[PDB]
Amino acid sequence: GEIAQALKEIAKALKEIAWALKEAAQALKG
Amino acid sequence: GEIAQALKEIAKALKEIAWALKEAAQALKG
Amino acid sequence: GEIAQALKEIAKALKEIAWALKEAAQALKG
Amino acid sequence: GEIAQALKEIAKALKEIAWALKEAAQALKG
Amino acid sequence: GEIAQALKEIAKALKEIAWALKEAAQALKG
Amino acid sequence: GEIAQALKEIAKALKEIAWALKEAAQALKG
Amino acid sequence: GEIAQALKEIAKALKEIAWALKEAAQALKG
Amino acid sequence: GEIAQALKEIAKALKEIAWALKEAAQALKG
């Protein structure tokens, strides 16, 4: 369904936030 | 539908947050 | 509809968070 | 309606988060 | 209604996040 | 009801995020 | 119910974000 | 159900955000 589809797109975007934070953590290690 | 499209707009906005955090990560790199 | 309208206002606010984070990233570059 | 009005209150709160992050960005500027 | 009530409690908690970020911004000014 | 109670649990978790950010603000103060 | 169950899992994940931020605050104290 | 499963995917994504913030906390530790 389209509402479940759209909530799965929200989950994917949250995972992109997680990956960006991981990239931030690597920059702080530097 | 209207509600699924609005949820998809929320996902896109979350992706824009991820891109902004990547810009932050890059700024820390130096 | 008013619920879709309100979810689109949530998306707009999330984009304002993204823009604030971009401004933060520019400050870290400094 | 009650639920749309509550979702609009959530959007306003997210905007307050954006303003707070702008204050953070300004504090980093110096 | 109880669902609108609970969404207004979510808005209040988001405002508490905003206030904490403002306190963070003041600490960075220091 | 079950759903309102779960939304209230989400609000409480967001408040715990606010408290953690206050701890971060205090750590920056020195 | 499964939707209330899933919203309680979202609350638990938000508490894990709070705990991670507390760990961050301890690192800034250092 | 589809919607509960999508909400559970959102919880998992939030947990990935928590793990990324823990990586950030560790990077600050030194």
Numbering used by the authors:
A (entry chain A), B (entry chain B), C (entry chain A), D (entry chain B), E (entry chain A), F (entry chain B), ...: 1 to 30
According to the publication:
Despite the requirements for aliphatic residues at a and d, up to 40% of these can be changed to other side chains without compromising barrel integrity. We introduced mutations at one or two of these sites to generate four groups of αHB: Group I had entirely hydrophobic interiors, but with different sizes and shapes of channel; Groups II and III had polar uncharged or polar charged residues, respectively, at specific points along the channel; and Group IV had aromatic residues installed in their channels. In detail, the sixteen Group I peptides included: previous designs for a pentamer, 3 hexamers, 2 heptamers and an octamer all verified by X-ray crystallography;27,29 single and/or double mutations to Ala and Gly at central a and d sites to generate larger channels; a single-Pro mutant at the final d site to kink and open the C-terminal end of the channel; and a variant with all a sites made Met to vary the hydrophobic chemistry used. Finally, one third of the designs were crystallized and yielded 12 X-ray crystal structures, all of which were open αHBs with fully accessible channels. Conversely, the FAs generate signal through interactions with the more-hydrophobic and aromatic-containing channels (Group I and IV).
